[PDB]
Amino acid sequence: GFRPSRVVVVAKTTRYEFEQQGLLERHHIHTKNVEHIIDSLRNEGIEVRLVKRREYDEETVRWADAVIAAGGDGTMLLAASKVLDRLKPVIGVNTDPERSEGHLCLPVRYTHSFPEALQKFYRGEFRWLWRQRIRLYLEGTGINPVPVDLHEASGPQLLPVRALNEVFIGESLSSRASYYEISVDDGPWEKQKSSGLNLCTGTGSKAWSFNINRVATQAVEDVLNIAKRQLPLNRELVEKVTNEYNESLLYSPEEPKILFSIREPIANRVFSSSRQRCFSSKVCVRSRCWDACMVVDGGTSFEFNDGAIASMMINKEDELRTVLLE
Amino acid sequence: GFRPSRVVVVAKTTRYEFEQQGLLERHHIHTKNVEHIIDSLRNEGIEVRLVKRREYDEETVRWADAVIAAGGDGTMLLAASKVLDRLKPVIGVNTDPERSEGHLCLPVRYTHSFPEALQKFYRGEFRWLWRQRIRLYLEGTGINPVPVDLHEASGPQLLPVRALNEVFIGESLSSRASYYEISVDDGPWEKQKSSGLNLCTGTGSKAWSFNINRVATQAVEDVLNIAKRQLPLNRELVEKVTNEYNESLLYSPEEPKILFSIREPIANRVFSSSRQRCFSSKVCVRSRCWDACMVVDGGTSFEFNDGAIASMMINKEDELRTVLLE
Ligand SMILES: NC(=O)c1ccc[n+]([C@@H]2O[C@H](COP(=O)([O-])OP(=O)(O)OC[C@H]3O[C@@H](n4cnc5c(N)ncnc54)[C@H](OP(=O)(O)O)[C@@H]3O)[C@@H](O)[C@H]2O)c1
Ligand SMILES: NC(=O)c1ccc[n+]([C@@H]2O[C@H](COP(=O)([O-])OP(=O)(O)OC[C@H]3O[C@@H](n4cnc5c(N)ncnc54)[C@H](OP(=O)(O)O)[C@@H]3O)[C@@H](O)[C@H]2O)c1
Ligand SMILES: [Mg+2]
Numbered sequence A, B: 001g002f003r004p005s006r007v008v009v010v011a012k013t014t015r016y017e018f019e020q021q022g023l024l025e026r027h028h029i030h031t032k033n034v035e036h037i038i039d040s041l042r043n044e045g046i047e048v049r050l051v052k053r054r055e056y057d058e059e060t061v062r063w064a065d066a067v068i069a070a071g072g073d074g075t076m077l078l079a080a081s082k083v084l085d086r087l088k089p090v091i092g093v094n095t096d097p098e099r100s101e102g103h104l105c106l107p108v109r110y111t112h113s114f115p116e117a118l119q120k121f122y123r124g125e126f127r128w129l130w131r132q133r134i135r136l137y138l139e140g141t142g143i144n145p146v147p148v149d150l151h152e153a154s155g156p157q158l159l160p161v162r163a164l165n166e167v168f169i170g171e172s173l174s175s176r177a178s179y180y181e182i183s184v185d186d187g188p189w190e191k192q193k194s195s196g197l198n199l200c201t202g203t204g205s206k207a208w209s210f211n212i213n214r215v216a217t218q219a220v221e222d223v224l225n226i227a228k229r230q231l232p233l234n235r236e237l238v239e240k241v242t243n244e245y246n247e248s249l250l251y252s253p254e255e256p257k258i259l260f261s262i263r264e265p266i267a268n269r270v271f272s273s274s275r276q277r278c279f280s281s282k283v284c285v286r287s288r289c290w291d292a293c294m295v296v297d298g299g300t301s302f303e304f305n306d307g308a309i310a311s312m313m314i315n316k317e318d319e320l321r322t323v324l325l326e
């Protein structure tokens, strides 16, 4: 079984609010789905607190026996940003299924049919899913560990956020390429040059790390012609090879490997570079950057310039307690 | 034949200067190659003016019969930024061949053997090469056409820079993905979502646009196994297919097609997206962005947020008069 007696809900802040604080149809809907959620809860003898960005403090989180994101994977990532305890269930409801993807949120039937999931909880007609998350240690010189809420010679210190999707590292200016020395599973330092790095979990293996590494159905077409050029096949086969490739880009969130990737490295005779991607347990990056940041779930940011040393790994006491319905 | 009687030289600004205004070995070398260039010129009866960033004005450029970049492709891009006349020869000398790539600069023998090229000019033992460049028209609402030198309801107006490598468009914050409606060779508008766009010339087909689109020798390995899985071959064959692919990413600078590309678009059931890349004559982009810029050769920048409409094409009167030695 499972039913909590205290719940905080953290609702995204629709563009119609973003301004006030076809964009009305947007807001009326998100409202008409927060409403259906809170009223389904209160119909089950459940004290609920409803909050937005700055209200949603960890004090709220401690109070509640579970946490609901009423929004999208952002709002998931948001709520899942302020949760360190691997026992606290974090739950998201896709509040806008024509706009919000909601890959971290429940099946979309449960949006307007919410008491149904709730029943499935009291009865346990579900599963528990502990998604691994990435934690980050910052050492080096001149470092600056104060996080930055993007949504408006020292030692190793634990930064106050766990990365559920990925950690992004690169120059702030999107056009100034990035320089840093990197070490994987405690290997020798290799000076890469790229437009950044991306160290996802299996949760975020579908996220940003997918759209980097994935290939074109065309780039597949090309390479295959070129192969019999340098038993043929057709349109249908192109996709029954292309996806089997791109499948090998995703892994199970429970798997505790980090999938790091070089984001557009730089070839040539003065910038000899390593691999594109591979899995690991632990990475370590020495910023040789002038004005870069460390960017977690596209939501929190740390100053990561020269002499700073960030080192990412997975720890079990970070796995995120989430659920799972048929 | 060809020999100019007036020359401006525009030298990069080495890190040892960047600070003052192993980094000394760096500076002593760049100096010992600007020296060898100016003295080779003055040994040919050639008035020379030597300049850095802010000195290098268009007034300098008008005065000189030709323009020399003493640096790298940056310094090339720099000098080639302030030249609109397709008759003014722009010439670059790789001033630091262990660090500067210099794909826009002369062969590297000509760095310490500079009077030799000069002879090759008086004698015409060379070729003229007019690299096509990209020009940019900004229309729409609330637009802001003042350029920004990254190196520290209105009509269409010509922005004051020609793009030699590429024009980059995307959100300034490297993690906030980008939204805009785009039109190619005057086609229907298609709403993409990505980490940016990249519209290069054949000059910059090797540049940024290469490291996006190019594939792994591994991603090739994978896809090929997967093919006979879903006449085999080995390590050697992997590279005699991989490059023949990646070759099809570069085109001749004289060719006046624009190679645009979607930089990490976003898949799924709410973000249906177009193609990765293809050539065109003319693109048009309607910014649906909150805080994006237009970034030219990684050197000049324009504000490109919502309602602004940028539209890129190639015009012959922009081809960049450069040379070519054996
Ligand atoms: N060009 C790219 O591929 C790109 C660029 C920046 C960020 N991102 C990703 O998006 C995250 C930032 O949070 P955000 O969602 O508020 O930005 P976003 O703009 O909403 O991200 C783009 C789309 O990816 C989906 N998504 C987010 N997290 C996912 C996950 N773990 N698995 C599968 N899909 C996911 C989102 O669905 P929702 O609509 O429900 O949010 C979103 O519609 C970051 O983890 C980053 O990984 C991707
Ligand atoms: N991750 C990437 O692929 C990336 C990221 C940002 C910018 N860039 C490119 O670099 C340009 C910015 O100027 P920058 O050179 O001062 O930055 P940069 O840091 O020097 O660019 C990275 C390297 O690319 C080489 N390069 C530059 N232009 C090229 C061209 N037209 N063809 C082939 N190679 C070229 C440069 O050689 P030099 O050392 O002689 O400059 C440089 O070492 C922009 O056009 C942009 O295209 C690439
Ligand atoms: Mg979102």
Ligand SMILES: [Mg+2]
Pocket (backbone or CB within 6 Å): B072, B073, B074, B075
């Ligand atoms: Mg450079």
